[PDB]
Curated annotation (Swiss-Prot):
May form homohexamers. Interacts with N protein. This is Papain-like protease nsp3. Residues 1-167 form the Macro domain. It comes from the Viruses. It comes from Severe acute respiratory syndrome coronavirus 2 (2019-nCoV).
Length: 167
């Protein structure tokens, strides 16, 4: 039993809800919130900009130190940093950004990072401003993640389309 509320159960381990991931994280304070990161951990827009804003830019300050020490992430890769006021930890995961010409096959590699954590609150990787098809992102999530994932979909119209088209 965990404190996630109002989710539709898609499979044994995947759950989905129309929700603002920022507001969800503040309410649940999960062990792990997933950020839709880029390799530079520059949290400007989309989920990343919203999460970073909610931390009063502390996420960005921490991230800049991480990059100065370690260099950029790989597309498909991840790092664990603080969750600040939103969660215990933030798993920054880089899905491919189609608007940059990155290989969509890397989406599966990106979701594999979730398997290192027993329970996560997450967005759909590569969706929104990363330009991939969200129906595809959900399919890859369900077929790749084996740990318990609670997906927040910000857009209600998209949420309804995601549920009604789910196989
Ligand atoms: O990963 C892309 C998604 N973006 C977010 N998801 C959840 N919470 C969010 N807050 C701000 C942006 C954001 C798209 C895909 C479906 O719905 C929005
Ligand atoms: Cl987005």
């Amino acid at each position: 039993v965990n404190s996630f509320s109002g989710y539709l159960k898609l499979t044994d381990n995947v759950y989905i809800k129309n929700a603002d991931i920022v507001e969800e994280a503040k309410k649940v304070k999960p062990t792990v919130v997933v950020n839709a990161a880029n390799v530079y951990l520059k949290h400007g827009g989309g989920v990343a900009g919203a999460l970073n804003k909610a931390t009063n830019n502390a996420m960005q300050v921490e991230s800049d130190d991480y990059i100065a020490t370690n260099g950029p992430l790989k597309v498909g890769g991840s790092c664990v940093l603080s969750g600040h006021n939103l969660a215990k930890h933030c798993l920054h995961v880089v899905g491919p950004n189609v608007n940059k010409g990155e290989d969509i096959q890397l989406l599966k590699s990106a979701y594999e990072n979730f398997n290192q954590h027993e329970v996560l609150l997450a967005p759909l990787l590569s969706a929104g401003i990363f330009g991939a098809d969200p129906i595809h992102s959900l399919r890859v999530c369900v077929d790749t993640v084996r740990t318990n994932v609670y997906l927040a979909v910000f857009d209600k119209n998209l949420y309804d389309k995601l549920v009604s088209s789910f196989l």
